């Protein structure tokens, strides 16, 4: 049923209450204003438990801090230091994401496939 509904490409706000634990996702990018993308969400982590982030999401800001143009290290810092309640604005950018992962491409619903 769900898998040929388009994934929304509009910006979303996501609030994650993780205390003084990890957010539970990894990021890639951040060279030359390339952008910061979620690459891996850990099963069972706070980011997974939210239900509102996926691989291919761009992190557009964290607690009001704009990361579209962040470096990789400074995004990671922002993320780790964001505090207990972390307000992300994300936007799913599957074509952009797919250029980081090998053999991966974007289907008609906008889902990222890896062959």
């Amino acid at each position: 049923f769900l898998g040929e509904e388009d994934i929304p490409r509009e910006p979303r706000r996501i609030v994650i209450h993780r205390g003084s634990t990890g957010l539970g996702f990894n990021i890639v990018g951040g060279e030359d204003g390339e952008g910061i993308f979620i690459s891996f969400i850990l099963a069972g982590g706070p980011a997974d438990l939210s239900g509102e982030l996926r691989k291919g999401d761009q992190i557009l800001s964290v607690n009001g801090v704009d990361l579209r143009n962040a470096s990789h290290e400074q995004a990671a810092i922002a993320l780790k230091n964001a505090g207990q309640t972390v307000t992300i604005i994300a936007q799913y950018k599957p074509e952009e994401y797919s250029r980081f992962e090998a053999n991966s491409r974007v289907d008609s619903s906008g889902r990222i496939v890896t062959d």
Partner: peptide
């Protein structure tokens, strides 16, 4: 390179 877990 690079991917960082947060």
């Amino acid at each position: 390179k690079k991917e960082t877990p947060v």
